[PDB]
């Protein structure tokens, strides 16, 4: 009851993050970095996924918030080689590029040196590590292209 000293004992929503419904990019301060995308490029699908899991678990143990873990579209490139005593290119092998991205935020400037040192020391063979600041273009690169929108935009140009 309101007048009783036990008023408000049942309150619970002040302990819960307000969830009242794409995502705004939060730039970091002078001492903390903003949203960061940790790209993992490799020719082996297992290596890319396994290291992304390792990075995701590493951040949790380091109390670093992980915004989102997702996979970039697979790139398939044909590999052709020139035949001996010939001028014709013949297909040799097919290579698929797999990219895994782990999105983190709130990284401290002083702690960035330690975090980058640990991840680069554990990088598997054949895996490329690239850490970039999150931008709108990178997020928009995960969506299908819209030729119909482009065609209408060309008329306006």
């Amino acid at each position: 009851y309101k007048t009783k000293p036990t008023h408000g004992i049942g309150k619970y929503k002040h302990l819960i993050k307000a969830e009242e419904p794409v995502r705004a990019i939060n730039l970091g301060t002078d001492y903390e970095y903003g949203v960061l995308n940790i790209h993992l490029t490799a020719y082996d699908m297992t290596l890319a996924e396994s290291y992304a899991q390792y990075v995701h678990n590493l951040c949790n143990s380091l109390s670093i918030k992980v915004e989102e873990s997702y996979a970039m579209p697979t790139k398939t490139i044909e590999v052709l080689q020139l035949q001996d005593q010939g001028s014709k290119m013949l297909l040799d092998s097919v290579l698929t590029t797999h990219e895994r991205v782990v999105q983190i935020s709130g990284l401290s400037a002083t702690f960035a040196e330690i975090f980058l040192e640990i991840i680069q020391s554990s990088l598997p063979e054949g895996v490329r590590l690239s850490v970039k600041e999150h931008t709108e273009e990178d997020f928009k690169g995960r969506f299908k292209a819209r030729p119909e929108l482009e065609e209408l935009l060309a008329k306006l140009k």
Partner: peptide, 29 residues
């Protein structure tokens, strides 16, 4: 009309400033 509580209210030790950084239960047990 209000009356102050006779003692420490529940969940008073919870720091609401760092609610995002606070560890959650995440489980029923």
């Amino acid at each position: 009309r209000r009356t102050p509580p006779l003692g420490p209210m529940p969940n008073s030790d919870i720091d609401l400033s760092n609610l995002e950084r606070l560890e959650k239960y995440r489980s029923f047990d």
